[PDB]
Structure 1
Amino acid sequence: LHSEIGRLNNQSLLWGPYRPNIYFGTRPRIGKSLMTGLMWGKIESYTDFQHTVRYTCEQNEGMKGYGWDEYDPRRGGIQSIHDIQNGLDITTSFVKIPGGAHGGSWAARIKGTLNDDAPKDQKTIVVFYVSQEGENSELEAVPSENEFGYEGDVILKGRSEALGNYKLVVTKGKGVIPQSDHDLSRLRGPGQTVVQSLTYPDEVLWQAKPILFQQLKAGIDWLVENKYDVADPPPPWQVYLLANKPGSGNVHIVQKVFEGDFEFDILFSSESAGKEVTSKDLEREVKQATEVFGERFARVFDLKAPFQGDNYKKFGKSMFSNLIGGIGYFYGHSLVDRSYAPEYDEENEGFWEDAAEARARHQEALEGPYELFTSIPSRPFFPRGFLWDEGFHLLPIADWDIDLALEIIKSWYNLMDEDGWIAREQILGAEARSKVPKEFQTQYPHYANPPTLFLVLDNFVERLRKLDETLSTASVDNPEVGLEYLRRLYPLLRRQFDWFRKTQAGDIKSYDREAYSTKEAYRWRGRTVSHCLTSGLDDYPRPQPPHPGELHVDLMSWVGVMVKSLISIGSLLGATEDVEFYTKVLDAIEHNLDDLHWSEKEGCYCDATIDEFEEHKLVCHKGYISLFPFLTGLLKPDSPKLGKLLALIGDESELWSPYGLRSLSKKDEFYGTAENYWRSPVWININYLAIVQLYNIATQDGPYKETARDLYTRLRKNIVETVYRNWEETGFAWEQYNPETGKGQRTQHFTGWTSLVVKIMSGHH
């Protein structure tokens, strides 16, 4: 039955707009298959269109905003794009239709509407780009009855082992198509829908904009060798309308040109299913998809006071939709240094110098290919998977569709190598590599990342103790399925546990350190003088200089999170010997946290080093790090140490801002210094952790109930309002919020862990 619930998920999820890197495109969860992408641009001039054309997501003064208003990966949704440069408000309605044995059929409505500043008669080029990768597959454009283009529909007929037979229809569409007077309309026609059919070697079909512009150049060079001159040049649009050449290939460019408002549909009909898909199908399924989304939101995300008003429901739907609508499918080789050079051991003072020499041998090589099905931090800036980001992404996704979140966890853990390592940044394929500077491509098998995917497993387990809607909850509804999922994954979770203990180990034994355990001590590998990228808190102040004897309370707390989950998962599977060993490790962690990381002087936890004189020092930097035992849920509700930390959290002179908890105390000597990334600003992911724990230390008998209820109430309000205000004014979720102003700053479209607020608004954790 697990395979059956499993075969039903593959089929539900196969098709999607799973190319979050571009404004709108589709691909299935198959490495080498059929991909679509939308391009458009105003043409007012002979040279402008190369600058106005839109394909891959950016965020600059020329784009007001874009995002999904509703989305569910199983059904589809509606995307709005607000393009200032091109005077357009574009709508992408996308919807799926189950049927057949090939993950079904789908359709999309592209709707463009000039804004009030657009020339009422603006000319707008729209391209629909279709490519097919694969060895024994065919795609052909049926030619048109008309002489130099198509008057009505465009029919692509194709077949693959993976998809079998399908047809892809780009419709005539409503909207004024402009005609030309000029001599040139003897050879190209007056103006019509046109199709070019090409072949390139599979590995370049992703480079749609260069492929398009190679055909626009050819057809411009062709005017110049046919004596068409500056005396009487044709209109810019006609110069940039392609010569119809429909045929068979792995690339089909379908070009329309429109005067004023316009709209056309894409209907992909799977031959495995019955009747072909129609625009009447599109309108029915979209209306239906909207009611369903509406009903599911109101149940899954019941916004509690003071946020029950419609304005907050709207904001909630935006944050949630953009988070889940970022889901992408990624396929290709990764770049990995597999030397495991001895300098990566970092066992010498000045180890950062040694590790740079090793990197400077550039031994890294492409390996794979791999697949990842994951949400992303940001479409314009980070259209790829980040390991500890996804743990936060999936908390709200799991609530909506636990079966989807478990598909994504599975996808991530299938990347785990034999030693237990998952690269913290998944850059799969050339398409992914193009958005990434050459210096950040190389992954390093000693580089860890917080294991937040365990927190999603925690929520999965608590909901286990206690048709598309049937599928979404099947792995909790049918407990035999959940168990089987956890049984298959468990050995991976354990392999990663051991990988942290082998690769990220602190040195207790070799220094003058007294502790309750000689085993439990951790140090983040990968840190430079200013940075610790592997912890996720890029520039949070750590011991200076970096040193093999450093110990990292945030790493120790994450191991803690892992063990609590391994004990819980192990108990369910009956791993009785393993559970006994976990309970010993947990115990030792609780004690060593105190014996190595607690500052009675400063009333918080701290990273440790060893002195210029070879003895253990605590290095205390009041902020997110200082609270990690608490944030990760390891302190007992009556701990005197919890009491001391709650003080710190509520202390307006240290971490309490009107807009949320500051990354670093105002009182710390590194507050607002250097790139000031994790050195003052408000981060929603850590604020989320603080809030969840406060609600927990507030819903139990104990001495901090009342204190922790005030803090929960206020921190909940401050964070939600900060993110709502900014969403009202800018239309964006942001990576961080300014602690002096509550202004969103740095990365935009951060949905992303900023979308964590939707969960914060509904409460009941």
Structure 2
Amino acid sequence: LHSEIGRLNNQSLLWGPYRPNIYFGTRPRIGKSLMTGLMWGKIESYTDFQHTVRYTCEQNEGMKGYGWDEYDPRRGGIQSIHDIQNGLDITTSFVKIPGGAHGGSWAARIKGTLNDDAPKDQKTIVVFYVSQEGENSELEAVPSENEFGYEGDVILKGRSEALGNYKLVVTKGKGVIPQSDHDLSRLRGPGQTVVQSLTYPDEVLWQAKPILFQQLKAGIDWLVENKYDVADPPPPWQVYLLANKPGSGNVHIVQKVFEGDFEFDILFSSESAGKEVTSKDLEREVKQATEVFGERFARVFDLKAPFQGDNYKKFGKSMFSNLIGGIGYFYGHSLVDRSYAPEYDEENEGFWEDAAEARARHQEALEGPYELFTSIPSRPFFPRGFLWDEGFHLLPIADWDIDLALEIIKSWYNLMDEDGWIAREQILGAEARSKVPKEFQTQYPHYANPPTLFLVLDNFVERLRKLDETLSTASVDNPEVGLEYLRRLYPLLRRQFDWFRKTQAGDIKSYDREAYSTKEAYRWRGRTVSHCLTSGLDDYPRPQPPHPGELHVDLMSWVGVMVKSLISIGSLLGATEDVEFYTKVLDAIEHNLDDLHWSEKEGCYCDATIDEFEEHKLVCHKGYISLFPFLTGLLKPDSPKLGKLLALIGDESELWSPYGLRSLSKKDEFYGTAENYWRSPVWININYLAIVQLYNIATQDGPYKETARDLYTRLRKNIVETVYRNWEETGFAWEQYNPETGKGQRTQHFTGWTSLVVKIMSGHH
């Protein structure tokens, strides 16, 4: 039954609009296969189109906003794009029709509506770009009945091992096609849908904008040769219409020009299913998907008081839809330093200078290929998997579709190398690499990242202990399936546990350090003077200088999160020799948290270092770090230490803003300093952890239950209203929120862990 549900998830999920890096295109979960993409651009002049044309997601003064109104990766959804520069509001409805043996069929409708400020007679160039990768695969444009191009539909017939036989139809569409009076109409026609079928070496098929422009340029060059000039030039929209040349190729450019409003359909028919897909089919199965997205959302995300309002329901569907609509499939080579230099051991004082030397050896090699199906922080800025980001992305996605979340976790853990390392940033392939400056591309097998995926796995276990509809929950509804998932994954869970303890080890036994345990101390590898990137809290203030002495309280707390899941899972699998080792290490961490990290002076947990005179010195920087034992669910609900932490959270003068918890205390000396990334601003992912933990303490007998109810109630409201107010006035989820004003700052379209806000509103944790 496990392998049965396996094949059915494969078949349910294969197709999707899995290129979140571009405004609109589709690819299946297959490295070398069929890919599509949408480009559009107003043409007002002979030189403007190269500047106006749209393909890969950006965010500037040109673009008001864009994202999914609804989306389910299994069914599809609707995206709206609000383009100021091109005077255009576009809709991209996308829908999957299950059937046959090759992962179903699909269809899309592209509707452009000119906005009020746009010329009523604007000419918009639109392209559907189609590539196929493979040795033994074929894609051919069925030629036109007319001489110069197509009066109606464009039929692409194609085949591969992966997809079998399929046909891909770019429909005639509704809308006015401008006609040219010029002499050139005798040779290129007056204006019609055109196709160019070409072939390039597979590894450059993705570079669609340069490939398109090479043909536009070749058509312009032909004009200049064939005596067409400024005495009598054709209209620009005809200068940029490609000479029709359909046929065989691994690249097919379908080009339309529209005057005013336009729409047109894309129809993918798997021959291995029944009859081919029609435009009437698209209209029906879109409407039916809206209904299903409708029903599911009210059940899965039932927003509790005071956010049951329709305004907050709109906001929820948006924050959710952009989060789950960011799901991509990525395929190709990681850049890695597999040199494992001695300098990356970070055992010297000045280890950061040593580690700079090793990196300037430039021994990083391409390796793979690898595949990853994952959600992303940001379509425009960060369209790729980030390890600790995905822990948060999947909290809401698990609610929606636990089997989708386990599928993504499975994809991530299939990346783990022999030693137990998963790179924290997954830049899979030349396309992925094109968005990342060379400086940030190379990964390092000593660079860790918080294990937040365990938190999703924790939530899976609690759900276990206690057809699209069917398939979303199959892995809890059928307990033996759930367990076999865990049985296969468990060894990699354990391997990762073991890999932290070997590579991210703190040094007790070498220093004037006493403690209940000589094993349990951790220090993040990878840290520079100002930064500790691998923690996730890029520029949070840390012991100066950085030092092999350091112990980092957040790291220890993450190992606590891992060990508690290991126990819960292990005990469902009867890993008895293991469950005792785990219990003994949990016991040691709890004690060693206090012995190495608790400060009575300052009334919070702290990082540690080693002094100019070689004693163990606590370094206290009131903020997110200071709370970590609490945020990770590690403190008993009666603890005095929890109590002092609850004071620190609630105190306006330290951490408590009207807009949520500050990264760092206004009293701390590093408040608002340097890049001020994690040194004041409000971050929804760490606030979400506090909100969850406060609700735990609040629905329980103990001394703090009543405080924790005021703080939960208030923080939930402060976080949600800040993200909501900013969504209302700017159309965006933001990476972080200003502690002084509540304004969204840094990067837009951060969905992204800012979408955690849907689950905050939903409550009943």
TM-score range, shorter chain: over 0.9
Structure 1 residue 359: Cα displacement: 0.1
1:264 Cα offset (Å): 0.1
Q: How far 1:50 moved relative to its partner?
A: 0.2
1:187 match: secondary structure = helix
Q: Secondary structure at the match of 2:126?
A: strand
Deviations 1:701-748 (A, max 9, x none): 000000000000000000000000000000000000000000000010
Query: Which string of whole-angstrom CA distances, capped at 9 and with x for unpartnered residues, describes residues 680-714 of structure 1?
Result: 00000000000000000000000000000000000
SS at match of 1:112: strand
Q: Which runs of 4+ in 1 moved over 4 A?
A: none
TM-score of the two chains, using structure 2 as the length reference:
1.00
Give the Å deviation of 1:750: 0.2
Distance in 1 (alpha carbons) for counterparts of 2:274 and 2:467: 19
- What is the alpha-carbon distance in structure 2 between the residues aligned to residue 157 and residue 736 of structure 1? 47
| Structure 2 match to 1:577 | 577
Deviation by residue 1:605-649 (Cα, 9 ceiling, x = unmatched): 000000000000000000000000000000000000000000000
Q: CA deviation at 1:144?
A: 0.4
Instruction: Name the counterpart of 1:136.
Output: 136
Mapped to 2, the partners of 1:229 and 1:374 lie a distance apart of: 51
What is the deviation of 1:662?
A: 0.1
Q: In 1, distance between residues paired with 2:573 and 2:86? A: 58
- Displacement of 1:596 in angstroms is 0.2
**Rounded Cα–Cα distance in structure 1 between residues aligned with 2:638 and 2:294:** 42
Q: Distance in 2 between matches of 1:200 and 1:185?
A: 30
SS in 2 for 1:572: helix
Query: Deviations along 1:232-291, whole A, 9 cap, x unmatched?
Result: 000000000000000010000000000000000000000000010000000000000000
Deviations 1:2-40 (A, max 9, x none): 000000000000000000000000000000000000000
Deviation at 1:327, TM superposition (A): 0.1
- Structure 1 regions of 5+ residues with no counterpart? none
| Cα drift, residue 749 of structure 1 | 0.1
Question: What secondary structure sits across from 2:269 in the alignment?
Answer: strand
Displacement of 1:668? 0.3
SS at match of 1:747: coil
Following superposition, the deviation at residue 459 of structure 1 comes to: 0.1
TM-superposed CA distance for 1:678, in Å, is 0.1
Once residues 25 and 581 of structure 1 are traced to their aligned partners in structure 2, the CA distance between those partners, rounded to angstroms, is 49
- String of CA shifts for 1:303-329, please: whole Å, max 9, x gaps: 000000000000000000000000000
Give me the whole-angstrom Cα distance separating, in 1, the residues matched to 2:46 and 2:606: 62
CA deviation map 1:458-515 (0-9, x unaligned): 0000000001000000000000000000000000000000000000000000000000
Give the secondary-structure state (helix, strand or coil) at the position aligned to 2:613.
coil
1:347, CA displacement in angstroms?
A: 0.1
Map Cα deviations across residues 508-533 of structure 1 (whole Å, 9 max, x no partner): 00000000000000000000000000
Task: For 1:631 and 1:735, locate their aligned partners in 2 and report how far apart those are by CA, in whole Å.
Answer: 20
SS of corresponding position for 2:261? strand
Could you tell me how far apart the structure 1 residues matched to 2:710 and 2:494 are? 39
Q: CA deviation at 1:657?
A: 0.2
Q: After TM superposition, give the deviation of residue 174 of structure 1 in Å.
A: 0.1
The aligned residue for residue 119 of structure 1 is: 119
Superposed, 1:644-723 pairs within 5 Å as: 644-723=644-723
Separation in structure 2 between the aligned mates of residue 133 and residue 651 of structure 1, nearest angstrom: 58
Distance in 2, matches of 1:263 and 1:236, equals: 22
SS of aligned partner of 1:249: coil
Shift of 1:330: 0.1
Q: Partners in 2 of 1:454 and 1:88 — Cα distance?
A: 43
| Superposition deviation, residue 409 in structure 1 | 0.1
The offset of 1:170, in angstroms, is: 0.2
CA drift at 1:679 = 0.1
Distance (whole Å) between structure 2 residues aligned to residue 187 and residue 209 of structure 1: 26
Aligned partners of 1:471, 1:135: CA distance in 2, in Å? Answer: 34
Match of 2:411 in 1: 411
Q: Secondary structure at the match of 2:715?
A: helix
Residue correspondences, number: 765
Distance 1:626 1:81 in 2: 42
Following superposition, the deviation at residue 751 of structure 1 comes to: 0.2
Aligned-pair distance for 1:197? 0.1
2:612 and 2:525 map into 1 onto residues whose CA distance is: 21
Measure the CA separation in 2 of the matches of 1:262 and 1:439. Answer: 43
**Aligned-pair CA distance for 1:97:** 0.3
Mapped to 1, the partners of 2:301 and 2:161 lie a distance apart of: 41
- Aligned mates of 1:365, 1:528 — CA distance in 2: 23
- How big is the shift at 1:186? 0.8
SS of aligned partner of 2:571: helix
| Distance in 1 (alpha carbons) for counterparts of 2:130 and 2:155 | 12
1:499 is paired with a residue whose SS is helix
Alpha-carbon displacement from aligned partner over 1:301-358 (angstroms, at most 9, x marks no partner): 0000000000000000000000000000000000000000000000000000000000
Match for residue 165 of structure 1? Answer: 165
Partners in 1 of 2:665 and 2:613 — Cα distance? 29
The CA distance in 2 between the partners of 1:274 and 1:138, in whole Å, is 22
In structure 2, how many angstroms separate the alpha carbons of the residues matched to 1:430 and 1:284? 38
State the partner residue of 1:262: 262
1:394-413: CA deviations, max 9, x gaps? 00000000000000000000
Question: Is 2:398 aligned against 1:398?
Answer: yes
Tell me, what secondary structure is at the counterpart of 1:370? strand
CA distance in 2, matches of 1:417, 1:584: 28
Q: 1:600 offset after TM fit, Å?
A: 0.2
1:185 aligns with 2:193: no
| Structure 1: distance between partners of 2:594 and 2:569 | 26
1:411-451 Cα distance to aligned partner (Å, 9 max, x none):
00000000000000000000000000100000000000000
3-state SS, counterpart of residue 608 of structure 1: strand
Shift of 1:59: 0.1
Q: Distance in 1 between matches of 2:227 and 2:161?
A: 47
Q: Does the residue aligned with 1:321 lie in a helix, a strand or coil? A: helix
> Structure 1 residue 114: deviation in Å?
0.3
Instruction: Provide the residue aligned with 1:457 in structure 2.
Output: 457
Deviation at 1:383, TM superposition (A): 0.3
Q: Distance in 2 between matches of 1:166 and 1:499?
A: 46
Aligned to 1:147: 147
Measured in 1, the distance between the counterparts of 2:699 and 2:622 equals 27
In structure 2, C-alpha distance between the alignment counterparts of 1:520 and 1:608, rounded to whole Å: 14
Q: Secondary structure at the match of 1:224?
A: helix
The root-mean-square deviation of aligned C-alpha atoms, in Å, is 0.2
Cα distance in 2 for partners of 1:188, 1:392 equals: 54
2:747 counterpart SS class: strand
The DSSP-based 3-state class of the residue aligned with 2:162 is coil
| Distance in 1, Cα, partners of 2:507 & 2:725 | 47
SS of residue in 2 equivalent to 1:502? helix
> What is the Cα deviation at residue 218 of structure 1?
0.3
In 2: Cα distance, 1:635 partner to 1:177 partner: 68
Determine the structure 2 residue equivalent to 1:281: 281
Partner of 1:469: helix, strand, or coil? helix
Helix, strand or coil at the partner of 2:746:
strand
1-structure distance, mates of 2:720, 2:179: 52
Report deviation, 1:294: 0.2
Q: In structure 2, what is the Cα distance between the partners aligned to 1:669 and 1:152?
A: 69
- How many angstroms apart in 2 are the aligned matches of 1:197 and 1:500? 51
* Mapped partners of 2:394, 2:473: distance in 1: 15
Cα distance in 2 for partners of 1:234, 1:332 equals: 44
Deviations 1:196-232 (A, max 9, x none): 0000000000000000000000000000010101100
Q: How far, CA to CA, are the matches of 2:340 and 2:535 in structure 1?
A: 20
Q: CA deviation at 1:570?
A: 0.4
Alpha-carbon offset, residue 548 of structure 1: 0.2
Alpha-carbon offset, residue 292 of structure 1 = 0.4
In structure 2, list runs of 5 or more residues that go unmatched: none
SS in 2 for 1:472: helix
Report the Cα distance in structure 2 between the residues aligned to 1:147 and 1:433, rounded to whole angstroms.
41
Structure 2 equivalent of residue 468 of structure 1: 468
Q: Deviations over 1:123-151 (max 9, x none)?
A: 00000000000110000000000110000
